[PDB]
Amino acid sequence: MVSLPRMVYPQPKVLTPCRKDVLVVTPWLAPIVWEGTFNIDILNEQFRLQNTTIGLTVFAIKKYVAFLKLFLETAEKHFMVGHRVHYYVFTDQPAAVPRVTLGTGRQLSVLEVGCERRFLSEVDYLVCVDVDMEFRDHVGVEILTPLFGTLHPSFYGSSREAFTYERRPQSQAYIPKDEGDFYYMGAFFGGSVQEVQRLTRACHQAMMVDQANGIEAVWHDESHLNKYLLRHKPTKVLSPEYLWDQQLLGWPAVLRKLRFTAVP
Ligand SMILES: CCCCCCO[C@@H]1O[C@H](CO)[C@H](O)C[C@H]1O[C@@H]1O[C@@H](C)[C@@H](O)[C@@H](O)[C@@H]1O
Ligand SMILES: [Hg+2]
Ligand SMILES: [Hg+2]
Ligand SMILES: [Hg+2]
Ligand SMILES: [Hg+2]
Numbered sequence: 001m002v003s004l005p006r007m008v009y010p011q012p013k014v015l016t017p018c019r020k021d022v023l024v025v026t027p028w029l030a031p032i033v034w035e036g037t038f039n040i041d042i043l044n045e046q047f048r049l050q051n052t053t054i055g056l057t058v059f060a061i062k063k064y065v066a067f068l069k070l071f072l073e074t075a076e077k078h079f080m081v082g083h084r085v086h087y088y089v090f091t092d093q094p095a096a097v098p099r100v101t102l103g104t105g106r107q108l109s110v111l112e113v114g115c116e117r118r119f120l121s122e123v124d125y126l127v128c129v130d131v132d133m134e135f136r137d138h139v140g141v142e143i144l145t146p147l148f149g150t151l152h153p154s155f156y157g158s159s160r161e162a163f164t165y166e167r168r169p170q171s172q173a174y175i176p177k178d179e180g181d182f183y184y185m186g187a188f189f190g191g192s193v194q195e196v197q198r199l200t201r202a203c204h205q206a207m208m209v210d211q212a213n214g215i216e217a218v219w220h221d222e223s224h225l226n227k228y229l230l231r232h233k234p235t236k237v238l239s240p241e242y243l244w245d246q247q248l249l250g251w252p253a254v255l256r257k258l259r260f261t262a263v264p
Helices: 040-048 062-078 117-122 193-212 221-231
Strands: 053-060 084-091 106-112 125-129 133-135 147-150 188-192 236-238 260-262
Touching (some): 053 117, 062 084, 062 133, 117 193, 147 193, 147 221, 188 193
Parallel strands (some): 053 125, 147 236
Antiparallel strands (some): 125 188, 147 188
């Protein structure tokens, strides 16, 4: 909206590819976010000028409440630093949530589980992740867009036939062998509040239909997420830098940074 201020940075090079080892744009022209493709200073300016507020939702039930301290502490160091952040921790153990010190402009709300209209008035974007993870490097506004999915670390180099999509036609999450762009992991997705609510409503309804027909998608929520993103292309796709498991997969040359990883 408002004009950007004067900024001094390296001129983009039209005749020099960002990466010669990976795909940086999808066939529907959505950027695939890898280190080396973006200038965070320009993006920070764009989103700060709009006073962007990002909501980060996480579910911590039962023994998973134990992962909250590390999750929140590292998010404080690497997640959307400089921007307004609102953490939403859904848990069955409110008193078990650790008291983590937050930077200015950042807040945390504990919601006990046993209205979505709130999200629409409190944040601009919603980022939904799993709690048994830790941030190890920058995860910022470069990911914000109407709707985004993240490439699963175990399948980014696999052919669609190898993807573990739901293959039974009796399921609403069904995807045949000749269809599919990527295999997105259910542990990291998001977008505008509106698009995220549309996705969750669609998946919830599809799961109810499957339940009524006596069938459960092979990878549950993740299977439905993949079916949804197949039919509603994400406006940005995050590379595996954003969802990794170093103990299981190491640190391949294709990853210049490991930003958000599984906790052993
Ligand atoms: C030692 C076990 C290897 C699992 C590799 C494949 O990852 C799994 O993929 C399915 C869908 O096919 C689903 O997404 C769960 C996922 O496993 C989780 O994520 C991987 C990356 C590891 O961190 C596992 O420990 C997780 O359980
Ligand atoms: Hg570049
Ligand atoms: Hg969410
Ligand atoms: Hg769905
Ligand atoms: Hg979903």
